[PDB]
Curated annotation (Swiss-Prot):
Alphabetical list of PANTHER family matching this protein: ATP-BINDING CASSETTE SUB-FAMILY C (PTHR24223), ATP-BINDING CASSETTE SUB-FAMILY C MEMBER 4 (PTHR24223:SF357)
Record-linked PROSITE patterns: ABC_TM1F, ABC_TRANSPORTER_1, ABC_TRANSPORTER_2
Source organism of the structure: Homo sapiens (Human)
Membrane-crossing segments per the record: 88-108, 131-151, 202-222, 223-243, 323-343, 346-366, 435-455, 636-656, 697-717, 762-782, 784-804, 880-900, 903-923, 964-984
Tissue localization of expression: Widely expressed, with particularly high levels in prostate, but is barely detectable in liver. sinusoidal membrane of hepatocytes.
Annotated ATP 2 binding sites: 1001-1008
Protein name: ATP-binding cassette sub-family C member 4
GO annotation, biological process: bile acid and bile salt transport; cAMP transport; cilium assembly; export across plasma membrane; leukotriene transport; platelet degranulation; prostaglandin secretion; prostaglandin transport
Domain (ABC transporter): residue spans on this chain: 405-618, 967-1200
Length: 1206
C-alpha cells in the first residue's frame, strides 16, 4: 500500500523538533493494539537498497584504490569516506550542546552573585538578574527540548550504517564460493547479521564524545580555575583517579562473572537432565540425588553471584558518592589554602564538577568501549567480505540453437588441498529429452555428477558448452519465508492455465485438504506448517513451472511416491522435458529400469553406461502482590524497615552535605557584614567546627551509600536464592501430568532466563532505580524547602507526567513488541538463502532474493524508526517537564528575593540543574524494572504449582514389605483427568505369589497405563492392596523404591559410572564389582579410559544403546527387589543385545515376580502365563492350550495374524 508516507516528510521544523507529527500514531496506540499495518514506511533515502548500493560503491572504490596502491583494503576507510560529511555536520550541535552545558553554571553564578549583594532598592540589578535568568532558561531549553532531534539524527546515522552493512553482508553471502562456504558456517554469518552488526547502532551515539569529552573537560577546568584557583585541580584529580580504578574494578567484575557462568551452565545442564528425564527420575525414586547435586551447584553459583553483586553495589555506591568526594576534596583544599567560601563560587564549582564528572565517568568510557566494539565488528565484517567468491558466471557463448555437448578431461575436486583427486574420469554427452539415470549410495559422487553442470565443481581453465537453463532440485527441499504464491511464482509471471493444469493433473489437492487456506496459505516460520513432501513437490513444481532446459533433480522422488514420480515423469520429464536436458539422479531401483539410459560412477570411475541389457541387477501489569511476594522472600519486614531507613539516611546526608556548604557561605557572609559594617576586628570563622562537620557529613554520605547498596543487593539476591530453592523443590514434587502438559523448553527457559534475570539484572536495575528516584525526590524536596510555593505548580506538573507516562507506555510496549517480531524474518531469510544457495545461483535469481531481503530489512527498519522516534517523543516531553521545573525554580527565586539568601538560592538552582538527567534516568529505569518483574511473576507462579502425594509419610510400612511378592488389582479405574478419556475400566487382576507374567495391549492403548497405575506416579483412581496394604499408606518414595522397572528407552545421567549405577551409595563396592562381573560388564567399564570414575559424556552419547540396556539391567540387578517390570516396547533395539538381556533377566531374576509389557509376542510366549488385556477389559484368563484353541481369544487372533508358530 501507499502506507502513510512518513509524516517526517511533511513535518516542518517545529513539528520535527517537538515530534508533533507522531501524535496521531499514539492516538490509535491508545485506542487499540498496534499492528504492522499501522506502521510508517521508511523514508526514500533510508531504503535498504539505496544505502546498500551507496556503500557498495564506496567499498568497491576503496578496494580498487587499495589494489592500486598495493595495501590491504580497510572497511573503516570506506565507512568514513561515506558518512564523514553527514557526521561532521551533526557534530556542530554537539559542540553547541557542550558549550551550553559549560556556560550554564556561569549564569547560575551570576544569579547567585546578585543574591549575595542584595539591595531591595536597586532596580537595575534586579533587571540584570532577570536577564541572567532568561539566558539560563534559554540554555536549559537548548539542553532539554533541542537535543532530542540531534539525538534522533545520530541514531539514524547509526541505523543507516547498520542497514547498509546488512545489505553488504547478504549481497556477499549470496555470491560466496563453495570452498569459502565450507570454511565458514551459516551460523557465523547469521551471527554477523544478528549481534556483530548491532554495535553500529550504539557507537554512533557516543562517537562525537571522543572529542567532546577531552575538550569540554579542559574548558570546565579552566572555568573552575577562574572561580577557585589551584584548589580546582584537587577535585579534578579525584575525577581522573576515578577513571582507571573503576575500570580496573570492572576487569575484576568480568572475571567473577566468568566463574559464575561455568557454575550456571553446569546447573542448567542438570536442569535439562532432570526435566528431560523426569519420568525416569520419579520412576526410580532418584529425586534426592539430583536435589542435593543441584543444591550444591546452586550454592556455589550463589556464592559467586553474591561476591559479584557486592562488587557491583560498591561500584554503584562509588558512582553515587563520587560527586560528594570531589566537592569535599576541592573545597577542603580551598578553605585550607586561606580562602573564604561564598555561595556563588561554591555552587558554580558544584555544578561544573557535576557536569564534568557525569561526562568523564559516563560518556567518555562508554564512547571508548563502544568504539572498540564497533572496530572489532568492522574487522570481522571486513574479513568476511573479502572471502573468496564463486567464479563469476561468464557470458554464455552464442549457442545458436545447437546441441554440441561434450565433457573431456573433467577436473572436479571437492577439496583442492586434497592430493587425492575427488573425481578423474567423467565424460558423457546429454541429448535433448533423453534421461540419464545416475545412481550412487548415500550420495556416493552424486554431488560431482550434479555440479558437473557448472554448479560448483567448475574447471579452473576452459569452458564446457552447456546450453539452456538449469533447474536444480537439491537433496534438502527448501521453502523460503513467504507464501506458496512466492515459491510457485519465483519471479515467473502468473501463468493461470499451466499452473491450473499442473495443480489438477499433478493432483496437489493434498495441500488444499491439509492446509486450512490453500495455495494462498502463509508459510509459517521455517515452513513447519508444510512437510518435506510439500517442499519436494513444490521444488519439482517450481522446476517444471519455470520450464527450464537442464533439469537437475537430486533424488526428488525419494520424498514422493512411485505414482507421483511416474506422473511427473510422463507429464514433465516425458512431455514437458521432451527436448529438454533431464540429468536425473535416481535410486530405489524402479526408475532405473523405468528410464532408458543409466550412468553409474564410483570415485571418478564410470561403473557402466549401458541400459538394462547389461544384466547389472543393481506485557501486562504486575500487581502489588508480585512485588510483595518478591520482597518478603528476601528478608523479614524489619529488615525492609531498616533498609528504607538506611536509604532515607543516605539521601538526607547527601543533600545535607551541600546544605552545609550553603549554610557555611551564609554564615561567612553575615560574618563579613559584621566585620566590615560593624566591628573593625576581622573575626575569623572557626575552621575546626565547620570543616569537621563538613567532613563528617561527606563521610556519612559515603558510608550510608555503601551500606544501602550492599544491603539492597544482599536482600534481593537472597530473595532470588529463596525463590529458586522453593521453585526447584516444588517442581521436583510436581506430578508427571505437569511435565507432560508443559514442554521441556518452557520449564528450562523458566529455570534459565528468569533465574538469570533475578540473579544478575533485576537487583542491579532495582538498586539503580531506587537510587535515582531518591535523588529526584531529594532535588524536588530541596526546591520545595527553599521556596514552599513551588508546591503549588508541582501538583499539576507531576499529575501530567503520570498521565503522559501511561499515554506513552500503551504505545511504546507495542512498538517494542513489533520491533521484536520484525527482526527474525531477516535472519530466517538469510538462513534460507544460505541453505539453498545452490539453486538460487542455478536460477540466476540473485536479484530477486536481494529484493526480498531488502523488503524484509525495510520492515524492520520501519520498526526501528518507530522505536527511535517514540522514545524521542517521550524524552522531549519529559525534558520539557524538567525544564519547566527549572524555569519555575530560577524565576521564583527572583520573584521571592526579599525572603531568600544566597545559599538557599544556590542550593535549589544547582539541584534543579541536575533534575533533568536524573529524572530521565529514573523514568527509564522504572520502566525497565516494571518490564523485568514478569520473570519474578513467572518464578512465583512456579513456586506454588500443585504437587502430588508426599514421598514419605510419618507412618512407614515394614522394611521387609516385599516378602511375599503378591500384588493384585481390585477394581481400579485409572483417570488421567477427571471427566476425561477412559483408560482403565474396573481393572481387576490376580497375580500369584512369585509368578512371572506379562500382558499385551494395542499399540500402547492400556500398555503404559498399567505401569502408571502400579507405580502410582500418575495417581490411579483405584483401591489396591498389594500384600494386603493400601497403596496409599506407603509413601511415594517408599513405594517406588521397592519397584524395579526397565524403561523402553534407557537413559544415562552425567556423572561417574558409580553414581549412575548407584547414586545413593547404598551398595558396597565389591557388590557392584561382583554383580557387574557376573554380567561381564566390569571388563567393559574397566577398558574405559577413565576407569571407575570415567567422565561420562552428554547422557552417554558415545555409549551404544546395547550398553544402555546393559547398564539399566545392572541397575535392576543392584536394586535387588522382589518384583521387576520389563517395559520392552522399543522398536529400534539391537537384537543381539535383546537376546542377551532376555537370557540375563531369565537367569538373574529367575524367581522374581516380573510384569512384562511388550509388543514382541515371542517375548511373552516364554512367560508361563499371559493375561491379555485391552481397553480396560480383561479379555483372556485361561490355560495357554485354551488360548490356542479358542478362535475368539485375542491371543490366538494375533497368533493367526502374524503367522508365527511355536
Ligand atoms: C547564549 C549567549 C550567552 C552569552 C550572552 O548572549 C547569549 O548572554 C547575554 C546576556 C547579556 C547581558 C544581559 C543584561 C545585561 C544588563 C545590562 O544593563 C542594563 C540593564 C537593562 C536590561 O539589560 C535594563 O536597564 C548591561 C548588559 C548585560 C550585562 C548583558 C551583557 C551581554 C550578555 C552577557 C549577553 C551575552 C553575549
Ligand atoms: C593541566 C591542566 C590543563 C591546562 C590547565 O588546567 C590544568 O592549566 C591551568 C593553567 C591555568 C592558567 C594559570 C595562570 C593564569 C594567569 C592568571 O593571571 C595572571 C597572573 C599573574 C600574571 O600577571 C598576576 O596577574 C589568569 C589565569 C591563567 C591564565 C590560568 C588560566 C587557566 C589555566 C590555563 C589552566 C588550564 C585549564
Ligand atoms: C593533583 C594535585 C591535587 C592537589 C594539589 O595539586 C594537584 O593541590 C595543590 C595546591 C598546592 C599548594 C598551593 C600553593 C602553595 C605555594 C607555596 O606556598 C605558598 C602558600 C600558599 C597559601 O598561602 C600560596 O598560594 C608552597 C606550595 C603550596 C602550599 C602548594 C603545595 C602543593 C599543593 C598542595 C597542590 C596539591 C598537590
Ligand atoms: C585525592 C587527592 C589526594 C589528597 C590531596 O589531593 C587530592 O588532597 C589535597 C589537600 C592538600 C592540603 C590542603 C591544604 C594544605 C594546608 C597548607 O599547609 C601550609 C599552610 C600555609 C602554607 O600554604 C598557609 O596556606 C598547604 C598544604 C596543605 C597541607 C595541602 C597538602 C596537599 C593536600 C593534602 C592535597 C593532596 C595531594
Ligand atoms: C582530544 C583528542 C580526541 C581524540 C582522541 O584523543 C584525544 O581520543 C583518544 C581515544 C582513542 C581510542 C581509545 C580506545 C580505542 C579502542 C581500541 O580497541 C582496542 C582496545 C584494546 C587494546 O588493548 C583494549 O584496550 C582501538 C583504539 C581506540 C579506538 C582509540 C583510538 C584513538 C583515540 C580515538 C584517541 C584520539 C587521538
Ligand atoms: C532524626 C532525623 C535526623 C535528620 C533530620 O530529621 C530528623 O534532622 C533534622 C534536623 C534539621 C535541621 C535543624 C536545624 C536547621 C537549621 C536551620 O537554619 C537556621 C538558620 C539561622 C541562622 O541563619 C536562622 O534561624 C535550617 C534548617 C536545619 C538545617 C534543619 C534541616 C532539616 C534537618 C536536618 C532534619 C533532618 C531531616
Ligand atoms: C559519624 C561518623 C563518625 C565520626 C565522624 O565521621 C563520621 O563524624 C564527624 C563528627 C566530627 C566532629 C564534630 C564536631 C566537632 C567539634 C569541634 O571541636 C570543638 C569546637 C567547638 C565545639 O563547641 C568549640 O567550642 C570540631 C571537631 C569535632 C570534634 C569534629 C571532628 C571530626 C568528627 C569526629 C567527624 C568524624 C570523621
Ligand atoms: C542527623 C543529621 C546529622 C546532624 C545534623 O544533620 C542531621 O544536624 C544538623 C543540625 C545542625 C545545627 C543547627 C543549629 C546550630 C546552631 C548554631 O549556633 C549555635 C548557637 C545556639 C546553640 O548553641 C544558641 O547558643 C551552631 C551550629 C548548629 C549547632 C548546627 C550544626 C550542624 C548541625 C548539627 C547539622 C548536622 C549536619
Ligand atoms: C524525607 C527527606 C527528609 C529530609 C529532606 O529530604 C527529604 O527534607 C528536606 C528538609 C530540607 C530543609 C528544610 C528547611 C530548610 C531551612 C531553610 O532556611 C530558611 C529557614 C527560614 C525561612 O524563612 C525559617 O523558616 C533552608 C533550606 C533547609 C535547610 C532545607 C534544606 C533541604 C532539606 C534538608 C531536605 C532534606 C533532603
Ligand atoms: C517524598 C517527600 C515529598 C516532599 C518532601 O520530602 C520528600 O519535601 C520536603 C520539604 C519539607 C518542607 C521544607 C520546609 C518547610 C518550611 C518550615 O517552616 C516552618 C515555618 C515556621 C516553623 O517554626 C517558622 O519558620 C516547616 C517545614 C517545611 C514545610 C518542610 C516540611 C516537610 C517537607 C514538606 C518535606 C516533604 C515530606
Ligand atoms: C519528612 C520529614 C518531615 C519533618 C521534618 O523532617 C523530614 O521536616 C524537616 C523540616 C525542618 C524545619 C525546616 C525549617 C525550620 C525553620 C528554622 O528557623 C525557624 C525560625 C523561627 C523559629 O522560632 C524564628 O522565630 C528552624 C528549624 C526548622 C523549624 C526545621 C526543624 C526541623 C524540621 C521540622 C524537619 C522535620 C524533622
Ligand atoms: C495540595 C497541595 C498541598 C501542599 C501545598 O500545595 C497544595 O499547599 C500549599 C499551601 C501553602 C502555604 C499557605 C500559606 C502560607 C503562609 C505564608 O506566610 C505565613 C505568614 C503569615 C501571613 O501570611 C501567616 O498567615 C508562608 C507560606 C505558607 C506556609 C504556604 C507554603 C506553601 C504551601 C504549603 C503550599 C503547598 C505546596
Ligand atoms: C509542560 C510542557 C508543555 C506541555 C506539554 O509538554 C510539556 O505537556 C505534554 C503532555 C502532553 C499530553 C499528555 C497526555 C494527554 C492525554 C491524552 O488523552 C487522550 C484523549 C484523546 C487522545 O487519544 C482522545 O482519545 C490526549 C493527549 C494529551 C493531552 C497530551 C498532549 C500533548 C501534551 C500536552 C504535551 C505538551 C507538549
Ligand atoms: C513562573 C514561576 C513559577 C511560579 C511563581 O514564580 C514564577 O509565580 C510567582 C507568583 C507568586 C505569588 C504572587 C502573589 C502572592 C500574593 C501574596 O499575598 C498573599 C495574599 C493571598 C493572595 O492575594 C495569598 O494568601 C502572597 C504571595 C503570593 C501568593 C506569591 C507566592 C509565590 C508565587 C506563587 C511565585 C511562584 C514561585
Ligand atoms: C518522582 C516520581 C517519578 C519517578 C518514578 C516514575 C515511575 C513510577 C510512577 C508511578 C507508578 C506507575 C503509575 C501507576 C501505574 C500505571 O498506570 O502503570
Amino acid at each position: 500500500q501507499e502506507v502513510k508516507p512518513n509524516p517526517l516528510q511533511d513535518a516542518n521544523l517545529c513539528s520535527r523538533v517537538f515530534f508533533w507529527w507522531l501524535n496521531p500514531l499514539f492516538k490509535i496506540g491508545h485506542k487499540r493494539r498496534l499492528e504492522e499495518d499501522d506502521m510508517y514506511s521508511v523514508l526514500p533515502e533510508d531504503r535498504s537498497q539505496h544505502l546498500g548500493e551507496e556503500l557498495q560503491g564506496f567499498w568497491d572504490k576503496e578496494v580498487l584504490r587499495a589494489e592500486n596502491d598495493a595495501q590491504k583494503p580497510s572497511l573503516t576507510r570506506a565507512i568514513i569516506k561515506c558518512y564523514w560529511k553527514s557526521y561532521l555536520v551533526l557534530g556542530i550541535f554537539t559542540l553547541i550542546e557542550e558549550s551550553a552545558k559549560v556556560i550554564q553554571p556561569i549564569f547560575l553564578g551570576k544569579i547567585i552573585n546578585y543574591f549575595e549583594n542584595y539591595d531591595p532598592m536597586d532596580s537595575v540589578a534586579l533587571n540584570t538578574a532577570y536577564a541572567y535568568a532568561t539566558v539560563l532558561t534559554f540554555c536549559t531549553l537548548i539542553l532539554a527540548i533541542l537535543h532530542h532531534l540531534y539525538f534522533y539524527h545520530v541514531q539514524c546515522a547509526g541505523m543507516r550504517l547498520r542497514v547498509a552493512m546488512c545489505h553488504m553482508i547478504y549481497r556477499k553471502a549470496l555470491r560466496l564460493s563453495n570452498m569459502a562456504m565450507g570454511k565458514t558456517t551459516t551460523g557465523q554469518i547469521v551471527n554477523l547479521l544478528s549481534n556483530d552488526v548491532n554495535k553500529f547502532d550504539q557507537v554512533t551515539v557516543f562517537l562525537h564524545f571522543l572529542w567532546a569529552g577531552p575538550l569540554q573537560a579542559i574548558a570546565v577546568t579552566a572555568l573552575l580555575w577562574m572561580e577557585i584557583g589551584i584548589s580546582c585541580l584537587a577535585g579534578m584529580a579525584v575525577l581522573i583517579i576515578l577513571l582507571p580504578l573503576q575500570s580496573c574494578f570492572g576487569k575484576l567484575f568480568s572475571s567473577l562473572r566468568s566463574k559464575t557462568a561455568t557454575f550456571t551452565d553446569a546447573r542448567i545442564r542438570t536442569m535439562n537432565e532432570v526435566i528431560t528425564g523426569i519420568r525416569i527420575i520419579k520412576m526410580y525414586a532418584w529425586e534426592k540425588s539430583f536435589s542435593n547435586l543441584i543444591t550444591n551447584l546452586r550454592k556455589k553459583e550463589i556464592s559467586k553471584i553474591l561476591r559479584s553483586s557486592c562488587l557491583r553495589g560498591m561500584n554503584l555506591a562509588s558512582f553515587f558518592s563520587a560527586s560528594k568526594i570531589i566537592v569535599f576534596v576541592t573545597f577542603t583544599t580551598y578553605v585550607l589554602l586561606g580562602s573564604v567560601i561564598t555561595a556563588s563560587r561554591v555552587f558554580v564549582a558544584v555544578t561544573l564538577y557535576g557536569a564534568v564528572r557525569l561526562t568523564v565517568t559516563l560518556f567518555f568510557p562508554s564512547a571508548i568501549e563502544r568504539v572498540s566494539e564497533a572496530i572489532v565488528s568492522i574487522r570481522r565484517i571486513q574479513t568476511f567480505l573479502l572471502l573468496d567468491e564463486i567464479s563469476q558466471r561468464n557470458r554464455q557463448l552464442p549457442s545458436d540453437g545447437k546441441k554440441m555437448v561434450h565433457v573431456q578431461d573433467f577436473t572436479a575436486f571437492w577439496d583442492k588441498a586434497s592430493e587425492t583427486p575427488t573425481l578423474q574420469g567423467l565424460s558423457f554427452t546429454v541429448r535433448p529429452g533423453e534421461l540419464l539415470a545416475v545412481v550412487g549410495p548415500v550420495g556416493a559422487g552424486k554431488s560431482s555428477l550434479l555440479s558437473a553442470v557448472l554448479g560448483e565443481l567448475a574447471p579452473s581453465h576452459g569452458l564446457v558448452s552447456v546450453h539452456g537453463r538449469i533447474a536444480y532440485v537439491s537433496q534438502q527441499p527448501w521453502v523460503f519465508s513467504g507464501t506458496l504464491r512466492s515459491n510457485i511464482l519465483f519471479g515467473k509471471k502468473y501463468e493461470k492455465e499451466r499452473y491450473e493444469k499442473v495443480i489438477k493433473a499433478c493432483a496437489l489437492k493434498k495441500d488444499l485438504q491439509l492446509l486450512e487456506d490453500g495455495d494462498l496459505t502463509v508459510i509459517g516460520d521455517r515452513g513447519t506448517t508444510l512437510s518435506g513432501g510439500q517442499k519436494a513437490r513444490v521444488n519439482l513444481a517450481r522446476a517444471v513451472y519455470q520450464d527450464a532446459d537442464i533439469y537437475l533433480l537430486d533424488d526428488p522422488l525419494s520424498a514422493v511416491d512411485a505414482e507421483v514420480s511416474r506422473h511427473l515423469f510422463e507429464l514433465c520429464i516425458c512431455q514437458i522435458l521432451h527436448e529438454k536436458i533431464t540429468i536425473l539422479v535416481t535410486h530405489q531401483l524402479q526408475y532405473l529400469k523405468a528410464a532408458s539410459q543409466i550412468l553409474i560412477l564410483k570415485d571418478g570411475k564410470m561403473v557402466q553406461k549401458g541400459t538394462y541389457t547389461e544384466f547389472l541387477k543393481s506485557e501486562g501489569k504486575v500487581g502489588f502482590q508480585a512485588y510483595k511476594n518478591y520482597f518478603r522472600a528476601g528478608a523479614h519486614w524489619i529488615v525492609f524497615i531498616f533498609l528504607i531507613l538506611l536509604n532515607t539516611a543516605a539521601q538526607v546526608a547527601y543533600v545535607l552535605q551541600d546544605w552545609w556548604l550553603s549554610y557555611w557561605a551564609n554564615k561567612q557572609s553575615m560574618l563579613n557584614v559584621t566585620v566590615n559594617g560593624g566591628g573593625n576586628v576581622t573575626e575569623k570563622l572557626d575552621l575546626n567546627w565547620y570543616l569537621g562537620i563538613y567532613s563528617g557529613l561527606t563521610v556519612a554520605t559515603v558510608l550510608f551509600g555503601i551500606a544501602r547498596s550492599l544491603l539492597v543487593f544482599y536482600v534481593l539476591v537472597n530473595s532470588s536464592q529463596t525463590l529458586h530453592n522453593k521453585m526447584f523443590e516444588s517442581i521436583l514434587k510436581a506430578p508427571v501430568l505437569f511435565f507432560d502438559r508443559n514442554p521441556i523448553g518452557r520449564i528450562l527457559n523458566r529455570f534459565s532466563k528468569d533465574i538469570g534475570h533475578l540473579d544478575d539484572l533485576l537487583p542491579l536495575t532495582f538498586l539503580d532505580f531506587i537510587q535515582t528516584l531518591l535523588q529526584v525526590v531529594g532535588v524536588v524536596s530541596v526546591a520545595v524547602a527553599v521556596i514552599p510555593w513551588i508546591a503549588i505548580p508541582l501538583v499539576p506538573l507531576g499529575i501530567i507526567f503520570i498521565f503522559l507516562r501511561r499515554y506513552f507506555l500503551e504505545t511504546s510496549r507495542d512498538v517494542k513488541r513489533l520491533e521484536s517480531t520484525t527482526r527474525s524474518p531477516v535472519f530466517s531469510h538469510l538462513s534460507s538463502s544460505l541453505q539453498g544457495l545452490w539453486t538460487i545461483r542455478a536460477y540466476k535469481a540473485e536479484e530477486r532474493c536481494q529484493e526480498l531481503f531488502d523488503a524484509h530489512q525495510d520492515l524492520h527498519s520501519e520498526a526501528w524508526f518507530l522505536f527511535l522516534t517514540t522514545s524521542r517523543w517521550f524524552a522531549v516531553r519529559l525534558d520539557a517537564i524538567c525544564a519547566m521545573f527549572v524555569i519555575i525554580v530560577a524565576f521564583g527565586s527572583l520573584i521571592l528575593a526579599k525572603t531568600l539568601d544566597a545559599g538557599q538560592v544556590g542550593l535549589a538552582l544547582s539541584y534543579a540543574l541536575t533534575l533533568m538527567g536524573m529524572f530521565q534516568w529514573c523514568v527509564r529505569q522504572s520502566a525497565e524494572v516494571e518490564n523485568m518483574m514478569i520473570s519474578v511473576e513467572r518464578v512465583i507462579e512456579y513456586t506454588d504449582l500443585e504437587k502430588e502425594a508426599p514421598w514419605e509419610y510419618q507412618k512407614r510400612p515394614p522394611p521387609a514389605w516385599p516378602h511375599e511378592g503378591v500384588i493384585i488389582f481390585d477394581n481400579v479405574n485409572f483417570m488421567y483427568s477427571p471427566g476425561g478419556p477412559l483408560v482403565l475400566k474396573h481393572l481387576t487382576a490376580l497375580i500369584k505369589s512369585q509368578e512371572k507374567v506379562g500382558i499385551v495391549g494395542r499399540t500402547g492403548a492400556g500398555k503404559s497405563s498399567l505401569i502408571s497405575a502400579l507405580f502410582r506416579l500418575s495417581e490411579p483412581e483405584g483401591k489396591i492392596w498389594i500384600d494386603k496394604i493400601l497403596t496409599t499408606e506407603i509413601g511415594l518414595h517408599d513405594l517406588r523404591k521397592k519397584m524395579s522397572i526397565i524403561p523402553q528407552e534407557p537413559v544415562l545421567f552425567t556423572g561417574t559410572m558409580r553414581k549412575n549405577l548407584d547414586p545413593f551409595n547404598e551398595h558396597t563396592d565389591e557388590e557392584l564389582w561382583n554383580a557387574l562381573q557376573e554380567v561381564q560388564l566390569k571388563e567393559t567399564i574397566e577398558d574405559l579410559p577413565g576407569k571407575m570414575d570415567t567422565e561420562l559424556a552428554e547422557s552417554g552419547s558415545n555409549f551404544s544403546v546395547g550398553q544402555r540396556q546393559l547398564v539399566c539391567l545392572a541397575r535392576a540387578i543392584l536394586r535387588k527387589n522382589q518384583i521387576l517390570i520389563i517395559d520392552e516396547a522399543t522398536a529400534n533395539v539391537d537384537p543381539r543385545t535383546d537376546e542377551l538381556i532376555q537370557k540375563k533377566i531369565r537367569e538373574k531374576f529367575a524367581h522374581c515376580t516380573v510384569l512384562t509389557i511388550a509388543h514382541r509376542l515371542n517375548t511373552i510366549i516364554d512367560s508361563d502365563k499371559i493375561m491379555v488385556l485391552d481397553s480396560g477389559r480383561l479379555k483372556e484368563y485361561d490355560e495357554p492350550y485354551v488360548l490356542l484353541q479358542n478362535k475368539e481369544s485375542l491371543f490366538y487372533k494375533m497368533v493367526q495374524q502374524l503367522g508365527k508358530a511355536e
